[PDB]
């Protein structure tokens, strides 16, 4: 009922497919040799973002890499798993690619990666994502229906503004969390000494 | 070399087995019916403690329960997995038991659960835990050698004091983290409205 009303919203809205280039990621085996190309899995896709600090690494390059290569802005959506998850890749020091359990959306025109993330995480965004899900107590996301999810269009300035509000708050959150931890590790070191 | 020197420390030190009752936990199948008894797995054994908020639940009760039943104070050690992990159970509202991948230490005399946790997490404690580990790039912890790990003895007052220092700092940490999150979810709701 909420999707009907959104589709009748009368809001200038594009289709995700109209504006993005979409490709699923390299399916690799768990038992490969570690290497230089890092690999984002459903478990590397964190709450406050992609945990690039614990990425499984593998070693496959050349023109193979060039098609699976994650670029700054790409929208990693969870195509498979328990929890549907939308994450935005940030250019890492290394080359990085996604698993095949992740649909990659490269925003090309009109929409910003983070604004697609904001829309998709909304109650309606989730509803549209669940339309695309044809799993039984598991996720299986129709790459085609996904690309058929409409997204409201607003200017790139009101987009880049809300991203900055969001990114400002998140860097704040990380400043607060890392302090609290350094302070907790200091208390922990008080104990260690305490038994010394 | 550090274990020799610890064993020659000349410190009044008991054996873990001398002071605790040790039992491994109920091995249950992933595909059982959910129920009333919760189940702590290697993945429920968090950094800042046992994540009782995401415990797999199962249904098996009676005099079976009464031997696997986790009690307030018990020291859950990781017998199997990637990371060795020592955690202290706190009486939950429900009955809770551990997986078979977890050795349970019930402190009985001299030592406090949390003080065994403090000792085991120390550089030496870890070294003694790694002596007990006979896995190749995985953990397999000799319940017998574990029980043969010596623990320094100090009064119950200097124990209950250092636990309180530790528990004070941890409740502080949780107060700080949950604030930072409520503040971040408020920023997130600013964005959601922003696209409204």
Token pair in block for residue A157 = 């300035």
Q: Which residues of B touch A180 (CB under 8 A)?
A: 173, 176-177, 180
* Elucidated via: X-ray
CATH of A2-153, one of 3.90.220.20, 3.20.20.140, 3.40.190.10, 3.30.70.260: 3.90.220.20
Domain spans, chain B: 2-153, 155-196
Q: Which residues of A touch B180 (CB under 8 A)?
A: 173, 176-177, 180
Q: Would the CB atoms of A122 and B180 count as touching at under 8 Å?
A: no
Q: Would the CB atoms of A170 and B162 count as touching at under 8 Å?
A: no
Token pair in block for residue A127 = 């509803």
Contact between residue A88 and residue A73 where contact means Cβ atoms under 8 Å apart: yes
- Nearest chain B CA: its distance from A6 CA (Å): 11
B76-111: burial string, b at 16+ Cβ within 10 Å, e else? bbbbbbeebbbbbbeeeeeebbbbebbbbbbbeebb
Contact between residue A50 and residue A28 where contact means Cβ atoms under 8 Å apart: no
> Which helix (H) or strand (E) covers residue B164, if one does?
helix B156-195
Cα–Cα dist B18/B150, whole Å: 9
State the virtual CA torsion across A153, A156, A160, A161 in degrees, nearest 10. Answer: -80
The residue written with tokens 């704040």 in the block is A172
Cα–Cα dist B97/B74, whole Å: 11
Q: How far is CA A114 from CA A74, A92, B127, in A?
A: 9, 17, 45
Alpha helices in A26-138 (DSSP H): 62-68, 113-121, 123-132
């Amino acid at each position: 009922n909420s999707i009907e009303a959104y589709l009748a919203d009368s809001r200038e809205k594009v289709t995700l497919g109209t504006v993005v280039d979409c490709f699923k990621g390299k399916a690799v085996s768990s038992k490969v040799v570690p290497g230089d190309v890092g690999l984002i899995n459903l478990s590397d896709m964190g709450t406050l973002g992609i945990q690039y600090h614990q990425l499984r690494t593998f070693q496959m390059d050349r023109r193979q890499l060039l098609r699976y290569l994650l670029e700054d802005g790409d929208v990693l959506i969870a195509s498979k798993g328990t929890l549907k998850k939308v994450c935005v890749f940030h250019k890492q020091n290394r080359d990085v690619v996604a698993s095949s359990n992740i649909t990659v959306l490269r925003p090309q025109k009109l929409l910003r990666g983070y604004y697609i993330k904001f829309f998709l995480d909304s109650p309606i965004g989730q509803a549209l994502l669940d339309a695309a899900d044809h799993g039984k107590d598991v996720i299986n996301l129709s790459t085609k229906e996904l690309l058929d999810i409409p997204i409201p269009v607003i200017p790139l300035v009101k987009q880049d503004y809300l991203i900055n509000h969001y990114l400002r708050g998140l860097t704040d959150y990380h400043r607060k969390l890392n302090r609290a931890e350094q302070e907790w590790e200091y208390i922990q070191n008080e104990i260690q000494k305490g038994l010394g």
